[PDB]
Amino acid sequence: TFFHPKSREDILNEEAKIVQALNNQRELTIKMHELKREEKDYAHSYSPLFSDPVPQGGSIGKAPGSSRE
Amino acid sequence: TAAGISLTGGRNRCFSEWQSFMHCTAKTDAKSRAQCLPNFEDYMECLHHTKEKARLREIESVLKQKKEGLEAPPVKVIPVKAIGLV
């Protein structure tokens, strides 16, 4: 009469919920690992404003024809 | 930054192909980046004149191994005082 354990079904349900949270963490973990290895845009990784990688050099003796795309 | 500025404030000697190569690297991605290896060899070539020196080496080597005469409008060296004489 003094033994009041939880029901077997409740134990299984609770452990299944815990394992589901654990698998969610495993998936988020693998996800972040993949996303860190993907490559970012030039604006996000180098410069948001002035997002053109192409330089323009010096402007004193600007020679017609020096521009090359 | 001073990249691209010559000793006189213009564009340095090797600007044009550098700018072409940057046009590449802007248009392409990391997977596609190998796509303009050619622009980069052109840049390094302007910088260091290596294949040009090699080509001149083969030309000189074959020239000095020749006893037959050369019939082509030649190159003449003049003193600096003689610029415009005659």
Side-chain angles (χ1 to χ4, degrees), chain A residues 7-32:
Chain A
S7 176
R8 173 170 181 279
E9 271 296 280
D10 291 331
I11 312 301
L12 294 174
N13 299 334
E14 182 36 30
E15 201 185 289
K17 197 221 291 194
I18 307 284
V19 173
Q20 170 67 315
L22 283 176
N23 290 123
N24 290 347
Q25 168 53 12
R26 187 183 164 261
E27 292 311 346
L28 173 69
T29 318
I30 192 68
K31 182 174 73 175
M32 310 294 78

Side-chain angles (χ1 to χ4, degrees), chain B residues 30-48:
Chain B
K31 186 160 310 182
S32 176
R33 179 60 46 80
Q35 186 272 332
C36 74
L37 182 44
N39 290 318
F40 185 67
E41 291 103 8
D42 278 13
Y43 179 59
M44 294 299 291
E45 180 54 293
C46 174
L47 271 173
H48 302 302

Side-chain angles (χ1 to χ4, degrees), chain A residues 39 53-63 65-69, chain B residues 3-5 8-11 15-20 22-23 26 30:
Chain A
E39 63 276 29
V54 190
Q56 295 316 127
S59 300
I60 300 301
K62 182 61 64 75
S66 63
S67 179
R68 188 171 312 158
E69 293 179 353
Chain B
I5 297 169
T8 61
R11 302 182 179 289
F15 177 80
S16 283
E17 71 281 12
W18 177 49
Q19 200 204 32
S20 67
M22 311 298 287
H23 287 113

